[PDB]
Design an enzyme around this catalytic site. Structure first.
Site, mmCIF file in Angstrom:
data_model
loop_
_atom_site.group_PDB
_atom_site.id
_atom_site.type_symbol
_atom_site.label_atom_id
_atom_site.label_comp_id
_atom_site.label_asym_id
_atom_site.label_seq_id
_atom_site.Cartn_x
_atom_site.Cartn_y
_atom_site.Cartn_z
ATOM 1 N N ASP A 15 0.692 -1.461 -0.097
ATOM 2 C CA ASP A 15 -0.025 0.190 0.008
ATOM 3 C C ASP A 15 0.832 1.114 0.174
ATOM 4 O OD1 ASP A 15 0.851 0.465 2.437
ATOM 5 O OD2 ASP A 15 -1.122 -0.558 3.338
ATOM 6 N N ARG A 29 0.674 6.652 -0.038
ATOM 7 C CA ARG A 29 -0.054 5.637 0.832
ATOM 8 C C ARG A 29 -1.572 5.695 0.264
ATOM 9 N NH1 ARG A 29 -2.838 2.577 3.035
ATOM 10 N NH2 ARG A 29 -2.587 1.723 5.361
ATOM 11 N N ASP A 34 -5.576 -1.285 3.728
ATOM 12 C CA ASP A 34 -4.347 -1.833 4.696
ATOM 13 C C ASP A 34 -3.936 -3.044 4.120
ATOM 14 O OD1 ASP A 34 -2.672 -1.232 6.746
ATOM 15 O OD2 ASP A 34 -4.136 -2.487 8.292
ATOM 16 N N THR A 35 -2.847 -3.024 3.461
ATOM 17 C CA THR A 35 -2.215 -4.419 3.192
ATOM 18 C C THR A 35 -1.517 -4.730 4.434
ATOM 19 O OG1 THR A 35 -0.337 -3.266 2.104
ATOM 20 C CG2 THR A 35 -2.143 -3.964 0.764
ATOM 21 N N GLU A 37 1.946 -6.006 6.260
ATOM 22 C CA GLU A 37 3.218 -5.598 6.496
ATOM 23 C C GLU A 37 4.121 -6.601 5.690
ATOM 24 O OE1 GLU A 37 4.190 -2.324 7.170
ATOM 25 O OE2 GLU A 37 2.288 -1.860 7.813
ATOM 26 N N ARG A 75 3.398 11.579 3.675
ATOM 27 C CA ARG A 75 2.966 10.574 2.573
ATOM 28 C C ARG A 75 1.763 11.189 1.958
ATOM 29 N NH1 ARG A 75 2.514 4.749 5.436
ATOM 30 N NH2 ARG A 75 0.932 5.947 6.203
HETATM 31 C C1 LIG Z 1 -4.493 5.403 5.016
HETATM 32 C C2 LIG Z 1 -3.971 6.549 5.871
HETATM 33 C C3 LIG Z 1 -3.049 6.333 6.976
HETATM 34 N N1 LIG Z 1 -3.131 7.165 7.895
HETATM 35 C C4 LIG Z 1 -2.057 7.087 9.144
HETATM 36 C C5 LIG Z 1 -2.755 6.331 10.288
HETATM 37 C C6 LIG Z 1 -1.896 5.566 11.000
HETATM 38 O O1 LIG Z 1 -1.214 6.266 11.830
HETATM 39 P P1 LIG Z 1 -0.076 5.433 12.909
HETATM 40 O O2 LIG Z 1 1.141 5.249 12.060
HETATM 41 O O3 LIG Z 1 -0.110 6.367 14.158
HETATM 42 O O4 LIG Z 1 -0.616 4.058 13.308
HETATM 43 C C7 LIG Z 1 -0.900 5.177 9.591
HETATM 44 C C8 LIG Z 1 -1.142 3.900 9.115
HETATM 45 O O5 LIG Z 1 -0.259 3.663 7.885
HETATM 46 P P2 LIG Z 1 0.255 2.311 7.706
HETATM 47 O O6 LIG Z 1 -1.016 1.328 7.445
HETATM 48 O O7 LIG Z 1 1.094 2.479 6.293
HETATM 49 O O8 LIG Z 1 1.371 1.816 8.703
HETATM 50 O O9 LIG Z 1 -1.122 6.135 8.602
HETATM 51 C C9 LIG Z 1 -3.407 8.518 7.765
HETATM 52 O O10 LIG Z 1 -3.469 9.292 8.702
HETATM 53 N N2 LIG Z 1 -4.590 8.678 6.796
HETATM 54 C C10 LIG Z 1 -4.785 7.759 5.893
HETATM 55 O O11 LIG Z 1 -5.669 8.022 5.178
HETATM 56 CA CA LIG Z 2 -0.087 -1.301 5.763
#
Ligand SMILES: Cc1cn([C@H]2C[C@H](OP(=O)(O)O)[C@@H](COP(=O)(O)O)O2)c(=O)[nH]c1=O
Ligand SMILES: [Ca+2]
Length: 129
Positions: A15, A29, A34-35, A37, A75
């Site tokens: 993702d 992103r 959510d893929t 890891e 991102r």
């Molecule tokens: C997809 C997405 C992720 N995020 C933030 C939430 C999560 O915060 P946390 O890092 O505090 O868990 C993280 C999850 O991305 P990843 O799934 O890439 O780890 O990215 C956003 O803020 N907005 C979004 O639309």
């Molecule tokens: Ca992920």
């Protein structure tokens, strides 16, 4: 919403990817998904799936939603298309991503993705197996 041009710099994982957008490198992103890891079950498969879609693509596009366009990590948040096919939707339809992170105001394609997830679930694909 509208599609804008970008070019591939590098596949990262299921993702996330690095694209050149308006001439500048950025990591994107994928919205609403959510893929796993890479170190998790189906992570390697999700990675491969996204990599193939973007590397095979003649045309990559990014589509921002109506809300925030960057997350707290810098991102880009977008729906990303490869030769017109949305990667976010394709991952979900294949059971390689769950619909997730549905924040108000960046949720234009929510119901499209949820319909894909239902069909992946019905088919017991991958994550849903
Ligand atoms: C997809 C997405 C992720 N995020 C933030 C939430 C999560 O915060 P946390 O890092 O505090 O868990 C993280 C999850 O991305 P990843 O799934 O890439 O780890 O990215 C956003 O803020 N907005 C979004 O639309
Ligand atoms: Ca992920």
């Amino acid at each position: 919403l509208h599609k804008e041009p970008a070019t591939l710099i590098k596949a990262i994982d299921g993702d996330t990817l690095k694209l050149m957008y308006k001439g500048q490198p950025m990591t994107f992103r994928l919205l609403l998904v959510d893929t796993p890891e890479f170190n998790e079950k189906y992570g390697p498969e999700a990675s491969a799936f996204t990599k193939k879609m973007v590397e095979n693509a003649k045309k990559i596009e990014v589509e921002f939603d109506k809300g925030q366009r960057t997350d707290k990590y810098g991102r880009g948040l977008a729906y990303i298309y490869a030769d017109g096919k949305m990667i976010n939707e394709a991952l979900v339809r294949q059971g390689l991503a769950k619909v997730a992170y549905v924040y108000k105001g960046n949720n234009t394609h929510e119901q499209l993705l949820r319909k894909a997830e239902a069909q992946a679930k019905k088919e017991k694909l991958n994550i849903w197996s």
